[PDB]
């Protein structure tokens, strides 16, 4: 309901802000918060270090709504064709972000929620088995956090 | 092409940390 | 369940990362995301501009678990005694963050969830009426975002 | 004291933007 939603929204705002302030001091609200923060930083670092190459590949992105799924799946399949590792996983997230930004740039905002769903499905079905076999997201935090 | 370049930098990033 | 929770967690990770990348380009995942981002930035800016004063007041924080609620409530009551405005609201969030960081510093991690609950309650009961009368959080985004 | 100083900078911040 509207009343509860208002209450729930205020709570989430508080949690979000506190999580952020804690992270700035190297603390975390929760393990989930720690993972989110590690992934954000790793994505930033990835995109910063390899700025030339990342801009290059994203400049090759010429998506239309009718070709975006094929573009997403074909890149991601090739990315993981001969293995999964933490760096390729960071690359997978960064690629998804780039696609969302490009979609909004070109007034294709409708693609944003679709890309998120495609990424979540891929993560669930194709990355999670490796992730669980390799120490889970807690292990990623230990390495890239 | 995109995926090749993405894969290359992903592996570089991986090699550094993991 | 464990299975669904895993799926839900992966989805939230995707949403979080995409929200962040969009915000870096001045876009937003949703209105809620826009508010969270505006509040984070405003808190950062507040704490940066008034660094001397903010450090000063936080250095006066000597909390124990038994005195933390009283300390929280007395500061917040005095903060809003003669009015609510967007800057005092930002100050309220920043103060809460500072209290959480200080609590973790002193191995009083148990206070973190308590502070969050105190803040959410205060927001619901004492700030929301002003906020709604003054254009809602969407108006805050327009001003401080 | 804490609240006074917090209030003062909150009002300064408010005055700048709002």
From Swiss-Prot, chains A, C:
Motif BH4 mapped to chain: 9-29
Disulfide bonds: none
Effect of residue 87 to A: No heterodimerization with BAX
N-terminal signal peptide: none
Motif (BH2): 129-144
Key words of the record: Apoptosis, Cytoplasm, Cytoplasmic vesicle, Cytoskeleton, Endocytosis, Membrane, Mitochondrion, Mitochondrion inner membrane, Mitochondrion outer membrane, Nucleus, Phosphoprotein, Synapse, Transmembrane, Transmembrane helix, Ubl conjugation
Cellular component, GO annotation: Bcl-2 family protein complex; centrosome; cytoplasm; cytosol; endoplasmic reticulum; mitochondrial inner membrane; mitochondrial matrix; mitochondrial outer membrane
GO-annotated molecular function: BH3 domain binding; channel activity; identical protein binding; protein kinase binding
Post-translational modification remark: Proteolytically cleaved by caspases during apoptosis. The cleaved protein, lacking the BH4 motif, has pro-apoptotic activity. This phosphorylation is partial in normal mitotic cells, but complete in G2-arrested cells upon DNA-damage, thus promoting subsequent apoptosis probably by triggering caspases-mediated proteolysis. Phosphorylated by PLK3, leading to regulate the G2 checkpoint and progression to cytokinesis during mitosis.
UniProt motif BH3: location: 35-49
Function: Potent inhibitor of cell death. Inhibits activation of caspases. Appears to regulate cell death by blocking the voltage-dependent anion channel (VDAC) by binding to it and preventing the release of the caspase activator, CYC1, from the mitochondrial membrane. Also acts as a regulator of G2 checkpoint and progression to cytokinesis during mitosis.
Domains: entry comment: The BH4 motif is required for anti-apoptotic activity. The BH1 and BH2 motifs are required for both heterodimerization with other Bcl-2 family members and for repression of cell death.
Subunit structure: Homodimer. Interacts with BCL2L11. Interacts with BAD. Interacts with PGAM5. Interacts with HEBP2. Interacts with p53/TP53 and BBC3; interaction with BBC3 disrupts the interaction with p53/TP53. Interacts with ATP5F1A and ATP5F1B; the interactions mediate the association of isoform Bcl-X(L) with the mitochondrial membrane ATP synthase F(1)F(0) ATP synthase. Interacts with VDAC1. Interacts with BCL2L11 (via BH3). Interacts with RNF183. Interacts with GIMAP3/IAN4 and GIMAP5/IAN5.
Protein name: Bcl-2-like protein 1
Organism: Homo sapiens
Lineage, highest ranks first: Eukaryota, Metazoa, Chordata, Craniata, Vertebrata
Gene that encodes the chain: BCL2L1
UniProtKB/Swiss-Prot annotation, chains B, D:
Protein location: Endomembrane system
Induction: By ER stress in a DDIT3/CHOP-dependent manner.
Modification(s) after translation: Deubiquitination catalyzed by USP27X stabilizes the protein.
Annotated motif BH3, positions: 2-16
Tissue and organ expression note: Isoform BimEL, isoform BimL and isoform BimS are the predominant isoforms and are widely expressed with tissue-specific variation. Isoform Bim-gamma is most abundantly expressed in small intestine and colon, and in lower levels in spleen, prostate, testis, heart, liver and kidney.
Domain notes: The BH3 motif is required for interaction with Bcl-2 proteins and cytotoxicity.
Function (record text): Induces apoptosis and anoikis. Isoform BimL is more potent than isoform BimEL. Isoform Bim-alpha1, isoform Bim-alpha2 and isoform Bim-alpha3 induce apoptosis, although less potent than isoform BimEL, isoform BimL and isoform BimS. Isoform Bim-gamma induces apoptosis. Isoform Bim-alpha3 induces apoptosis possibly through a caspase-mediated pathway. Isoform BimAC and isoform BimABC lack the ability to induce apoptosis.
Protein family (similarity comment): Belongs to the Bcl-2 family.
Oligomeric form and interacting partners: Forms heterodimers with a number of antiapoptotic Bcl-2 proteins, including MCL1, BCL2, BCL2L1 isoform Bcl-X(L), BCL2A1/BFL-1, BHRF1, and BCL2L2/BCLW. Does not heterodimerize with proapoptotic proteins such as BAD, BOK or BAK. Identified in a complex containing BCL2L11, DYNLL1 and BCL2L1 isoform Bcl-X(L); BH3 integrity is required for BCL2L1-binding. Interacts with YWHAZ. When phosphorylated, interacts with TRIM2; this interaction is associated with ubiquitination and degradation. Interacts with MCL1; may sequester BCL2L11 to prevent its pro-apoptotic activity. Interacts with GIMAP5.
Protein's name according to its UniProt entry: Bcl-2-like protein 11
Organism: Homo sapiens
Species classification: Eukaryota, Metazoa, Chordata, Craniata, Vertebrata
Encoding gene per record: BCL2L11
Coverage span on the entire protein: 147 to 164 of 198
């Amino acid at each position: 309901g509207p009343l509860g939603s208002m209450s729930q929204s205020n709570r989430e705002l508080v949690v979000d802000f506190l999580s952020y302030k804690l992270s700035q001091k190297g603390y975390s609200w929760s393990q989930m918060a720690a993972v989110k923060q590690a992934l954000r930083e790793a994505g930033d670092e990835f995109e910063l270090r390899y700025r030339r190459a990342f801009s290059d590949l994203t400049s090759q992105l010429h998506i239309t709504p009718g070709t975006a799924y094929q573009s997403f799946e074909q890149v991601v399949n090739e990315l993981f064709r001969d293995g999964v590792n933490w760096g390729r996983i960071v690359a997978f997230f960064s690629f998804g972000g780039a696609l969302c930004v490009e979609s909004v740039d070109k007034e294709m905002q409708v693609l944003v929620s679709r890309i998120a769903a495609w990424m979540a499905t891929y993560l669930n079905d194709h990355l999670e088995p490796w992730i669980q076999e390799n120490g889970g997201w807690d292990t990623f935090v230990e390495l890239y956090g | 092409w995109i995926a090749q370049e993405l894969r290359e930098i992903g592996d570089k990033f991986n090699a550094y940390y993991a």
